[PDB]
């Protein structure tokens, strides 16, 4: 039974320090992926890296044995570590959708003032806003009772922090994202929109194709993001607030925790593997 | 460990590095266009708006520095001197609408077909510039257009006429990723150098929409 | 027209009254010089480590 | 009309000679030799600060100094033995295709797209290297430039002729005209008495530099030559061409020796070179990749294989020791 359980999340965990570890290689060989582009995509890979080898192997611990056995200090830096290196992976796919807007809308800042200096100021963003969330509860704001009992390695279900910390890890980068992607949306469907008559036939199809190209990939890109941490989000804003009459199935909890800890394996696919220039080099390389 | 001389060498090195990295960041900020057509076609006309082998003309136009390269008076095979140049954003090409009847226009068409589907310039597009556009307008009226091309079942009247030769420039292109921005050019106003910056910003925005996945 | 082709008769008749050798004394010179320069060929005959300055001066 | 049948005349006679002079193909007699076998060569050093594609490079006469030029504007004299940069100098035209670097290490020239030849001195009174002098006088693209000593230089361009410089007054003191096209490279012999041109039209000459005239013409390929070198002993010479096919040509025999052709290549060649005995001949390909030949074979001995683009470039030192190859990637390295 635990046997299975192990080996399941074992894989998951190996398979993300490998996917993640190759993108950030890939940038650092090949001369070729060294944009400001792409390292925001590198520093992504390197943020969820840090997630597959602190935070994940501890959580399997306490899934598998089904207590926690390391210890009231460890206890502490699991969850200060899972929220700054969680907080950090969200914020940075809304760095990634601001480059991207204003390579869009504004072509003269793109040539001129689009610096790999913008790179590292988004990047060390991130991490500001990650320490933000994570630092209140380690040092203010916490309850005796969350720690009373040493089996078990709670976050702070403080009201408060509950409001402080859903929010601006998740809703407020949701909101962010959906804006900017929406304004890309529409940019993009005003160009794609502005013996011959063969020729004209083929300009014709070619604007339909495009039309479905900047639907799908905004659908994977959003869908991913939302499918995966939402469900858990939802649940960690009402059940603090409605203590009593809201028992969550032990195994539900499980499956939505897990499936937020599967976006780590899935953002290397969504933005490195899939474009073309990732899948040049690594031919290149292997 | 290092000797004197050796510790200068290295000096030496490291200042002319830092020069060689400034002066790249400084010219990766420049908009390159390559202008072809024919001799007497109205390069010269697109030269003045704009201010022995090759010739520079480099001018700042709303915050956009622009390098437009002149390669009319390299008389040699275009095979051995057209790869330098595959790095350039868009072509400029310009073409006599006038000169047809003194044929003039099938060699223009003819160099067109080439430089559109050479290896080095698959995608890069061409900012096409149809010169003495009232020349041709007074002149239709008595010589007519039949004489040039045989196929034209179409009416001698200015825009049909003009039309006409614009849509069988445009039959050249075979591959996506690439547009052809044909302009009738307008007298000696700031209009032609607009065409060309709307032209640019276009395949700027075309560029960075395919790197997403969204064009 | 005229004057180009009494150009090129001239030239070619230059270039045909020269003193050919047999190609076989030809190549044996070639070969000669080839196998008696041969010991100071380095990238023919891998130079010892100490020697090479692309590598351990 | 009858020019015409005359030369036509005298061109039977020229190749019943050349057939005449033919008994033994060098095939035959260099069957007895062993093969060279199984050479192995691997990157020592590689050379960055390029920013845009590699055109030409030259190395100097002591085997340590290297002349390079890109289409970024820079001309960048390196040191090979420890990756110094000893000098960047910036052209005032971007345009480069062509680089030489004077047999005594004082001068660099380049030239391109426009049509001068620029000379810098490169160790000054204020220390600061300088255009000196540009020869001007050609109506196409330089397309090579030979040195032949420290106040004469030799070049050819794409108005097919070369010329004879004087870079001390700037007048072409010589001209050397035939080609029935482009000129495409140059190569001077060990004594610089004479030198060898190879052209678009599928043809190369030898030409007299005292004299300036041609003393004869060789025609064995089917396409432009790109590139042209003289072998070690100075009595033949190698040709690259779009073929995809190098050639022997031999002096005294007046006629072709060899070929080096594989049907897995069908690229063609941008530059050739020979090693210190002649024993081995180097060509840069489009394939991104550079074969080693037996010259005495005609059968592969070896694949540098290492660059991402286009190999533009190639050369061998003086002594011999190590060749280094440019590319279109803007990265030089040197083999050993
Ligand atoms: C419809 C339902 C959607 C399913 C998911 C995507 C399906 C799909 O269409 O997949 C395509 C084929 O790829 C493979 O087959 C790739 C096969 C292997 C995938 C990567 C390696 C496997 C990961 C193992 C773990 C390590 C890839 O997507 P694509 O090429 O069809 O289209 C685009 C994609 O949608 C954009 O996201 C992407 O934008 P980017 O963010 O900049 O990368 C674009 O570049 C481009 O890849
Ligand atoms: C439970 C865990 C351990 C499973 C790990 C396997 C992972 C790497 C597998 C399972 C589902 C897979 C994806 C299924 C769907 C597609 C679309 C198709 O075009 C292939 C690529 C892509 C995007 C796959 C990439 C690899 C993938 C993410
Ligand atoms: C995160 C893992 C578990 C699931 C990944 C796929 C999820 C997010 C699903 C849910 C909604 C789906 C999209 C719904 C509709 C469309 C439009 C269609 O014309 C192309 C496919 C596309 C764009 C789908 C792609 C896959 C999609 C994004
Ligand atoms: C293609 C990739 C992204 C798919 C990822 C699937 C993930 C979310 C799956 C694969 C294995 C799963 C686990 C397998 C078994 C158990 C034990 C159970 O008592 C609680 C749920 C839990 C802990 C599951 C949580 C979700 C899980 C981690
Ligand atoms: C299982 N952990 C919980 C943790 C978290 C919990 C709350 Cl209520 C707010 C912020 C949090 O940081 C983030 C931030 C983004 C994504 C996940 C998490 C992680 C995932």
């Known amino acids: 039974y635990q046997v299975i359980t192990s080996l399941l999340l074992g894989t998951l965990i190996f398979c993300a320090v490998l996917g993640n570890a190759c993108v950030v290689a890939a940038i650092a060989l090949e001369r070729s992926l060294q944009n400001v582009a792409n390292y925001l995509i590198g520093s992504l890979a390197v943020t969820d890296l840090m997630v597959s080898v602190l935070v994940l192997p501890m959580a399997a611990l306490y899934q598998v044995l089904n207590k926690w056995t390391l210890g009231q200090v460890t206890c502490d830096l699991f969850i200060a570590l899972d929220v700054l290196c969680c907080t950090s992976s969200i914020w940075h796919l809304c760095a990634i959708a601001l480059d991207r807007y204003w390579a869009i809308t504004d072509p003269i800042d793109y040539v001129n003032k689009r610096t790999p200096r913008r790179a590292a100021a988004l990047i060390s963003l991130t991490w500001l806003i990650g320490f933000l969330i994570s630092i209140p509860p380690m040092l203010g704001w916490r309850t005796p009772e969350d720690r009373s009992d040493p089996d078990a390695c709670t976050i702070s279900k403080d009201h408060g922090y509950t409001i402080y910390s859903t929010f601006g890890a998740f809703y407020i980068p949701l909101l962010l994202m959906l804006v900017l992607y929406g304004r890309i949306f529409r940019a993009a469907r005003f160009r794609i929109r502005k013996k011959n008559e063969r020729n004209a036939e083929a300009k014709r199809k070619m604007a339909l194709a495009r039309e479905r190209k900047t639907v799908k990939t905004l659908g994977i890109i959003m869908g991913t993001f939302i499918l995966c941490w939402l469900p858990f989000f939802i649940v960690a804003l009402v059940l603090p607030f409605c203590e009593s009459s809201c028992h969550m199935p032990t195994l539900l909890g499980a499956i939505i925790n897990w499936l937020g800890y599967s976006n780590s394996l899935l953002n290397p696919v969504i933005y490195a593997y899939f474009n073309k220039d990732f899948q040049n080099a690594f031919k290149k390389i292997i | 460990t290092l000797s004197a001389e050796e510790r200068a060498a290295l000096e030496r090195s490291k200042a002319i590095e830092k020069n060689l990295k400034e002066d790249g960041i400084s010219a990766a900020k420049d908009v390159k266009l390559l202008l072809l057509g024919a001799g007497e076609s109205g390069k010269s006309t697109i030269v003045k708006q704009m201010k022995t082998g090759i010739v520079e003309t480099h001018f700042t136009f709303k915050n956009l520095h622009f390098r437009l390269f002149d390669v009319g008076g390299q008389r040699s095979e275009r095979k051995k001197w057209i790869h330098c140049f595959e790095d350039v954003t868009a072509i400029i090409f310009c073409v006599a609408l006038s000169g047809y009847d003194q044929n003039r226009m099938h060699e223009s068409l003819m160099l067109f077909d080439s430089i559109c589907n050479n290896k080095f310039f698959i995608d890069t597009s061409i900012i096409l510039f149809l010169n003495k556009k009232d020349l041709f307008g007074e002149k239709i009226k008595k010589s007519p257009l039949t004489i040039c091309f045989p196929e034209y079942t179409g009416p001698n009247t200015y825009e049909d006429a003009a039309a006409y030769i614009q849509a069988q420039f445009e039959s050249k292109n075979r591959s996506p990723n690439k547009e052809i921005y044909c302009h009738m050019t307008c007298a000696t106003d700031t209009n032609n150098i607009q065409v060309v910056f709307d032209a640019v910003t276009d395949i700027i925005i075309a560029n960075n929409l395919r790197g997403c996945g969204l064009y | ?57 | 009309d009858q020019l015409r049948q005359e030369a036509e005349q005298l061109k039977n006679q020229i190749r019943d000679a050349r057939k005449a002079c033919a008994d033994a193909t060098l095939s035959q007699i260099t069957n007895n030799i062993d093969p060279v076998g199984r050479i192995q060569m691997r990157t020592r050093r590689t050379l960055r600060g390029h920013l845009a594609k590699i055109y030409a490079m030259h190395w100097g006469t002591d085997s340590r100094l290297l002349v390079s030029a890109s289409q970024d504007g820079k001309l960048i004299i390196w040191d090979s033995y420890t990756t110094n940069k000893v000098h960047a100098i910036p052209l005032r035209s971007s345009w480069v295709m062509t680089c030489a670097y004077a047999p005594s290490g004082n001068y660099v020239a380049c030239g391109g797209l426009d049509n001068i030849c620029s000379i810098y001195n490169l160790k000054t009174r204020e220390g600061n290297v300088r255009v000196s002098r540009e020869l001007a006088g050609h109506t196409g693209y330089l397309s090579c430039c030979r040195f032949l000593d420290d106040n004469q230089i030799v070049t050819s361009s794409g108005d097919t002729t070369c010329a004879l410089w004087d870079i001390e007054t700037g007048q072409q003191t010589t001209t050397f005209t035939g080609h029935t096209g482009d000129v495409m490279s140059l190569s001077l012999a060990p004594d610089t008495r004479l030198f060898v041109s190879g052209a678009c039209d599928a043809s190369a000459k030898l030409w007299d530099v005292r004299e300036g005239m041609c003393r004869q013409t060789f025609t064995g390929h089917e396409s432009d030559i790109n590139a042209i070198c003289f072998f070690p002993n100075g009595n033949a010479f190698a040709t690259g061409s779009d073929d995809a096919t190098c050639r022997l040509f031999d002096l005294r025999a007046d006629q072709e020796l060899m070929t080096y052709s594989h049907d897995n290549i069908i690229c063609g060649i941008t530059s050739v070179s020979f090693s210190k005995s002649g024993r081995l001949l180097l060509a840069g390909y489009d394939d991104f990749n550079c074969n080693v030949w037996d010259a005495l074979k005609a059968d592969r001995a070896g694949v540098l294989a290492g660059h991402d683009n286009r190999v533009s470039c190639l050369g061998v030192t003086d002594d011999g020791m190590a060749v280094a190859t440019g590319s279109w990637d803007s990265f030089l390295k040197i083999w050993n």
């Open chain 3, 1 to 57: 027209s005229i004057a180009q082709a009494r150009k090129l008769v001239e030239q070619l008749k230059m270039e045909a009254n020269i003193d050919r050798i047999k190609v076989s004394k030809a190549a044996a010179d070639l070969m000669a010089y080839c196998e008696a320069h041969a010991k100071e060929d380095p990238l023919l005959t891998p130079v010892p480590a100490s020697e090479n300055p692309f590598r351990e001066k």
